[model samples]
Target: MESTLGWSVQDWLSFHSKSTPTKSLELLENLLKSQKPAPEDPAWISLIPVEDLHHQWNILQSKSNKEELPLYGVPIAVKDNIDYKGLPTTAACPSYLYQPTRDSYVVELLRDAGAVVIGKTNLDQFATGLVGTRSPYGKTPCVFNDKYVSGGSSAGSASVVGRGIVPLSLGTDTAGAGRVPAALNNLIGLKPTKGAFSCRGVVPACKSLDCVSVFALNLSDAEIAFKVMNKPDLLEDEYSREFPKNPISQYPKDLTIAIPKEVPWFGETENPKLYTKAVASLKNTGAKIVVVDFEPLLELARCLYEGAWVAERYCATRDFLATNPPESSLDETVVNIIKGAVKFDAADAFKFEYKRQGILQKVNLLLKDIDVLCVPTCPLNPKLEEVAQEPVLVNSRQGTWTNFVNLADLAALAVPSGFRSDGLPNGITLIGKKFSDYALLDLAKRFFSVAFPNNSRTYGKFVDRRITVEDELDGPSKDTLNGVKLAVVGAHLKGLPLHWQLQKCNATYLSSPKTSNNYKLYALPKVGPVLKPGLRRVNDGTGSQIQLEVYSVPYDRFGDFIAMVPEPLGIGSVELESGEWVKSFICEEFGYTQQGTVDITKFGGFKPYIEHIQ
Candidate 1:
């Protein structure tokens, strides 16, 4: 299996220090050389010009010596629906594609972080459908099975990461566009606390409800992307919100997890087994699950169709729809719904708001005890043909639980639970009150672990670098240098020698385990453990590989360890399985000259190798 050396921006840079610009470029070039367009690739729009990509690659090589760039030499992709300076914002419809003169605010932030935007990806037409096939591009099948659907309006973005094309891609979510695809594809769909990510440059389906979403294989990747792109800018985007001044993470031990009293497991044909299964999964993890009437939530959403909000949709496309009415642009049902807005007067808008406020009060009381309202991201992944058969009802069916989150100003994290027996993936969405994004992500991380226990990959699993939540203008619970992300294996394996180095170094404890596949852990004979592993690099290899950790160093002392590394066993690059990379302790082949060590790839990682022998 040919694979690109996908690492977080940090991991790539760590390798850059060892390899010259020419060699580093070669590593990327090799990956692109065989960047196989999957069988379902056309369900995407690969806007990256091969020649232009090389041009960008050369530019990145020139900047390799510039240590100041954090995401230097990293490749990133954006959903076509969001604007990137030089690419056309297709939103999956060629006629609607508009060339953007500037990148979206979201894209600008990532670019400033030393990243490169490869090109735009495909999406459901106009960001309207959860099923990916609505686009003119092509039908996207579920990654695990071709017969199934790839849930989305953010289809291409999710598919790229899930298929391991790009480590991260940007997507926009209004009604589960970001979350639905993640659920179906076994990826992480992070819909940031609304306004935490900017929506200025996106083409909106529902302006007030639209959000710029982050799509990555795991939580860490999504988190890094979110924290990097979000910053308070009063002068720039009017819609972007400042991350809350005080963000909370730890909740009461007996926090309530709410389920709708009449869970719409697809239009009242309840799948008792599904909610029970999810509840069973949550309860085993120490969560106190509760059931409540979801009627109030659904009632509020139904009123949206009756309100002037639909008029806002008409306003969004009045100019274009007035001139060109394409069957591809608006589903007739949505057109009919938007038509109702014309019937309402300003008095009706006021009437709608007044009614909404009362419903919200009841909703708050209904959810007052719950830490998060957990529901299926989309109870089902409807196939392309099935959705087309009943475009409106089926599409509306998918949004059963998702429609109310943004309306109520809630934060959500959608994570994959398990695949349906039919081979389609299903996900659970965590709905938290405003500014609870971090708490929601934490809970999702824990929930993801048990729901898909066999997954093994933690949130942000692919990220290979040390990215802590400290002072990142928008991150949560970041105390000043309280902790560092540490990649542990042999001597630093929890109770071992170098394990104490973290405390001695005055660094806070973070993550542990194997290095990403971008590395090779070799045994170093002379070290006390005898079985001590000296991790190294490999330009070519297979995965089913090692895990890696992320630790932080105090802002004042990050350079101290860089100076302390011994010969051959020094700090270098390591990639996590989730396609992220970071600087980790690595060794040169020179250190393995005298060690009697077995190739432990079969053992998967150092901890397992040690346990097996003992």
Candidate 2:
């Protein structure tokens, strides 16, 4: 059996770092052969020949310091839309194939890093649709189960990763092409902050919204690849940007993560449960879960294809669309969707832009206090047969969470969350504000680990570097840190429902200090959501000291955390054993009088109280 069945960055790095170029290429050839059984894989459009592979390898061998190259001899796949020297840039349109004299900016970076471009993968024609079936080549299906749509226009890119063919591959994202397929196939789809990765040598889908995406088996691999592929800006690429900020190295102890108050599953009933399962796990990561009505975000997503943005897509392919050869006919669904762009005039484009601005404002305000937003990578996973029945509608629905990412100037990372009962993969995406790609990847890596702890390789299972406590604390120094000290007595403690809230705030868990012997703790019974505990001040000094965890959160976001607390519980000052006062949760008199309420002051803390009950 090929060990490459599941290889990570460390696996490839170890193999290439030790193996001679001759043996490396030989093993790579065997790996590729094992991965592609036939031309019908639906993931490949063209593969590099054996001689070309050898020649590429020999060139690397000729370099005196080849070992110094980060990617030295690793094989990677490129989406058909990207230019690769002599390979035809098809963009999935046979008639539009054109040989490029050089590699695209992204490929150039990969090559400089010693990566070998093995083949061009299939995609949606002109990168027009999110469904993998829009390609004339063949509909790419999920790697786990062939019946489900693989996701597109980066379908082929994702298929290669999911199947462990090549450790890494390139993809492009306009709507959900990069992420939708990733979720369906159980891979990481990295949609960099727009313009972060140069796009000069790539075909445009919606030029403004188009991004060069990456598909990898895990986040460590994807994160390394992103670092290698990112360039400050390309002087020749008009869309390339001088990236404004580098993602922060550390996140707050806890994050204010938002989920949709109302989500649409679009008939994929199993999707809702999968999403909830993912959310439930997120709750344990010390994230402050805030549910917001995602109506505006969905509306912004719909606007991409539903409004003037379609005109941008039409313009990218208009030349070829106008004179598409009859022999190389276009996908009818794609043709109709692009042709519909004619319905909008320049005035409509401006009007749509105006509408987009308003929506973005609403979106910005909605996310003002949010640290990150998690949403279903795709609302539904349809069967290939089902997609064929209503291709456009199914494809449009897939972009429910993706289409607005680039348009809103956000970065997104998609990771496999779980699987449906039927065995198809389910995934969730973490969307971050602009320049938050690095931070998003960091959180995605953490979220996936906890969400699927059983599958070691599911997240960074095979990562070579050991994640030590020091690495975990490598972010901000304690003294320079900004936050309000919060004393949590109940569910907001280390192992509770709202414990994630403290973690999300980047709150540092301090000593398990006891309050002054003048407070009473109660397990408020039959409360709204999760069971909670409340503290009340006593005037007679007849109260017992209670146990609680003290955490420091940024003062600015303290209000956001406070916003999630139910009534009858509020932030107030508490005196610690040292007679030091810190802001903490205080219960109103109403919670003290609730029926079934128990005075847990006997246990002195929630942790012991729960153990006693259990």
Candidate 3:
């Protein structure tokens, strides 16, 4: 069968019925071993032994009908910072290694769902740095380009998923550890509310800010893994929290989305354009877009390291650092960071808490009216050598967009936005309120469908290439059109002059279809620089079916879009190949009077007609 390496939750469930759980585990074992990264790539700290894998497989085989489990036989990777029984929780620090006698609260839920642990992947040592390169294990390079830095402290986990090795992996996010790597690798990093996922088994970066995160190749799989692991812990994990109510099933059709008024690209010019293009796509999803000040959010981000939160990191590792051989145990940068935190005493800590509370209130007030807050997942992708030379500055820049989420107690989802001019990946994150994880996913599904260009698939080739919530909610096309369907025969078609107008008005292109064989198309004569096509219905079946593009625009925007059409063109019903009719553009008979107005019905499509002439 298929290697279950990149198989999603649904794929694993379906494949389980045809093969034994033991077979599925064996395939995963082989997939993991085969794609093992070179030591220099630094993707793993320790992998379970072949015997250990089989032992786990045998245990799973004993379970009643593995198919009943949500993640039957699926292989999952654990970030080395998080505990996995029988494996050392290194946090990329050799001296800090410890074998956990029991599973981490979150990992326990994953096993209960039948997900077998493959190994513990590497990360920034002690989860101290955002750049994955800080770990002594070796720098985890960007999945798309080796020279570039793989975002971290969750670097190894994100790199593994990006390379299509495992479907789901666990990562920790204190200051964008889970998110930045995900954006660089083109995966979804779900950073739920700070306390949504328990922090018991995780080696703390900043205990107050830490969040257990989910990294997956697709949003659906991410949500699946998150839902299973987001349960309330039996251990009275002090950081755990519960919400009175969860997010709604579907976002309102007229949802409002917030974008940063002034975005920081950190001298990379291509990123600003990528963010603009992503927002344009959101507008096309029929969501109202508004610009909000990013100043408050940036201030909140500073509290993680700039204020006194660094003291928490110091508290987490100080005793161990004091007793162990420091130079041998941790990265130099990590050692320096922890030492720096020593400057903050009780007063400094309390002072930062006061600042955090004030900023939190402002941040929450800003988001109170917005359904989703969108931002670039990472400002830029720095080169591996660049990170090695200037680790602190580059690492700090990476957290520009992500640092504030956990501090403000918001849920965030990071998904691939698109690629930059250099052909490297870029991403946009959707942030929502506490317990808004489900709503954010739903919003992400909508954004994913329309925000990306045609070359970019929503899930990027993990599943059957279906982009519907039904694919996630139930199984897989097993979903359909949402807004007002419109048909266009001219420049409003994709890759044409007027296409931006359609996208700007929130039009979602549906299908390119031929009009029923009852119409004729004409290359309408332009007065100046305006170019368009006219489709005229002709009776007696004398005409051939002509080319047209169909799209769904917001019902509210339909009339205003029609107002943009000039004198000769108007809205009318046009039949498609399936004999279904949608409102489309039609021409008044008088428009054929202009000289050189040519009947181009035989040319098939407006695009074809233009191509034939050139």
Candidate 4:
């Protein structure tokens, strides 16, 4: 029951199954005593005060209300671009920083739902750009890898969700700021149709295109977050519109999904594997698939950044874009492009409407037969170094498929497909006609089921290890402590995403370097292209290096966590600091045949090998 386990009150109440305020606090105390990572650290801007949270917990413990509030006690993150009173919303640009006098409509609703406000996460300034790499605070890369980008401007919120530190988070999507990061990090991204979610406190990207978004570990969590904040408020927001549930035609069990044949892949070689795996899963659901040309849709996507819409980006910030250029920290390329368009007269604006109307007409015709538009969430992700060398080009390449959705006023969800041959994640996004949010979710639930991480557990050969916390009294081997130990590898390695994933699970980093000494490490390929070493113990001397991260998640939540992992990777025995073995990441030997791997056992550890190779 450590207050800092990062558990929402409901999470603690449900898991611990204790009702008294005193017992719950004591339990929370024990849980917090178990791990260490404080909110004052920069990864998050602010978090609920532990004492304030405990007060509410105590109140809830005394009540017998069984009311079902969608996000009761869940902790959620919001992008800094949105206003949340009392905390300065920097939008990662200090010049425009300010503390609003009141919460944004969305923030108020979330707070009302019993959720604890975590912090205002970092984002690209003014919510511009696909690269989360824009913010001044720091660039956020994928949870598993540091060098690669965490598609942004909703970087921080997405990082929280991707790490599984929190179940759901808020980000604004006005050019895939919401969806892009979700795709990159293997999480669910839900971009509501324009006007479906209020834009009262949102900074405009394209005023018409701006829509709030959510990132969740699961669809259900996203839905929970949605229920809590789905309200219409026209007074504080210009874009508020009553969101009515529109039921689209029930998809055929033998449904057909249309894909763009000439899809832009951004130089990715393993593109086929993603499509292949998704199609393979679709087949299992008894659906029929057709590789139809979605070229019209693809053309519409281009309009977001190209064509006349580029002018609208300037219009969203016309005053400063034109007059304040000298005082702004705006990217010169961005500023120059936006500044050039300020002279467009009213007639020119109308002309853009005319052209867009003609395009949408063709788009509607093209969509008549297709139930859903299925496309690569990203054809490819640029390597970090490649982007550094040519930032604009690489970022533009990453957003090719994503750019146009908002222009078309479509609702979409970016769902994970599966990992590539080397282990990095590749995903597909489902786009639907505007107001088709639920339809997209229905499709995603099925897709997510197949794409879900494989966390089914077997009775792992049990291993017992003792760990002592600095806050508690020390005892000998015979002392009985009531808890469990976990094994971490990648993100939870130390200062990584999901590092909080371990902390949230009441797990701590081991004080010593430990490993199975049986696993061989490999550089998993593609975009941050995560590094995953194959762990297989061959002959005594044949084993390569493996790094171990251990945590102690509650016994109950273990199943859900395991289920979060996908295939080709499984949990198996890992040797620890004391030479005792416990569960860790293990790869089936058959996958190694064509992997182009080498045995580096002589290095004695994965970290050393990683340093050598990278």
How do all models score by TM-score? Answer: 0.70, 0.75, 0.74, 0.66
lDDT of 3 by residue, 412-452 (tens): 88877877778777788888878777767777777776764
| Reference-based lDDT, each prediction | 0.67, 0.79, 0.79, 0.63
**Residue 439, candidate 1: how far off, in angstroms?**
1.6
lDDT of 2 by residue, 195-248 (tens): 889998898778888899999877667877887877755687888886442235
Residue-pair clashes per prediction, in order, are: 24, 16, 0, 20
lDDT for model 1: 0.67
Which candidate tops lDDT? Answer: 2
- For candidate 4, write residues 371-404 as lDDT tens digits: 6778778766655676678878877776777877
Candidate rank order under TM-score: 2, 3, 1, 4
Q: What CA RMSD would you report for each candidate?
A: 14.7, 9.9, 10.8, 20.6
Which segments of candidate 3 are over 4 A away from where they belong?
Answer: 1-5, 35-41, 453-471, 474-614
Q: Which ranges of candidate 2 are over 4 A from the true structure?
A: 32-39, 454-614
Which 10 consecutive positions of candidate 1 have the poorest summed lDDT?
463-472
